[PDB]
């Protein structure tokens, strides 16, 4: 027999993601690089591996949408809500949605896609919000010109372990 896990997390270390569609604001390459770097934040400190799929069903489906876009969390136009992601699980579990009424960038302007994605992927992997104002998982956007803060390291490692501690 098996009882359910005590904590919510992926039961496998190999995860896939798919960029379903793209924001007008950035090139396809810029978007891909931002998401690749955001996953690397987490894989660098765990045994997790992330592989991109171009099509089909991935664990973490990524999309840009506005207003009502297929879930119970409609976006709200410019400002306010920026993005959200679902905790590990089937279907919408793990998926990350970005409000395409925001301006997404690879700079300090607008909202930096890499930084927001790194936060959202923390949710995709099983972290909720942190009370440390300096944590990536703190629930308000700040721009930083990357080192994953220790609170986030401790949180993600509590779920998945550290992987190789010196890679
Ligand atoms: C860097 C990047 C982002 C953050 N923190 C962020 N917090 C929010 C709002 S809280 C929330 N989480 N999902 C939906 N809404 C959006 S980006 C912190 C540091
Ligand atoms: Ca918004
Ligand atoms: Ca999913
Ligand atoms: Na936009
Ligand atoms: Zn959504
Ligand atoms: Zn959040």
Please give the tally of structural domains in the chain.
1
3-state SS string for the chain: CCCCCCCCCCCCCEEEEEECCCCCCCCHHHHHHHHHHHHHHHHCCCCCEEEEECCCCCCEEEEEECCCCCCCCCCCCCCCCCEEECCCCCCCCCCEEEECCCCEECCCCCEEHHHHHHHHHHHHHCCCCCCCCCCCCCCCCCCCCCCCCHHHHHHHHHHHCCCCCCC
Residue nearest atom 15 in ligand 1 by C-alpha distance: 84
Which technique?
X-ray
Kindly provide the resolution of this structure in angstroms, with one decimal: 1.2
| Domain carrying residue 160 | 1-167
Check which CATH number belongs to the domain holding 75 and give it. 3.40.390.10
Residues in a beta bridge with 158: none
**Residue 97 Cβ < 6 Å to ligand 1:** no
26 a known binding residue? no
């Amino acid at each position: 027999y098996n009882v359910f896990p005590r904590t919510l997390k992926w039961s496998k270390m190999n995860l896939t993601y798919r960029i379903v569609n793209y924001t007008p604001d950035m090139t396809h390459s810029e978007v891909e690089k931002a998401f690749k770097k955001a996953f690397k934040v987490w894989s660098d400190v765990t045994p997790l591996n992330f592989t991109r799929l171009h099509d089909g069903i991935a664990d973490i489906m990524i999309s840009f949408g506005i207003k009502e876009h297929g879930d119970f969390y409609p976006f709200d136009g410019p400002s306010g809500l920026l993005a959200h992601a679902f905790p590990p699980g089937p279907n919408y579990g793990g998926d990350a949605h970005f409000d395409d009424d925001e301006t997404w960038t690879s700079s300090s302007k607008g909202y930096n896609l890499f930084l927001v994605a790194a936060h959202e992927f923390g949710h995709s992997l099983g972290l909720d919000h942190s009370k440390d104002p300096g944590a990536l998982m703190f629930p308000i956007y700040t721009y930083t010109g990357f080192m994953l803060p220790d609170d986030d390291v401790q949180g993600i490692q509590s779920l998945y372990g550290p992987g190789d501690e010196d890679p």
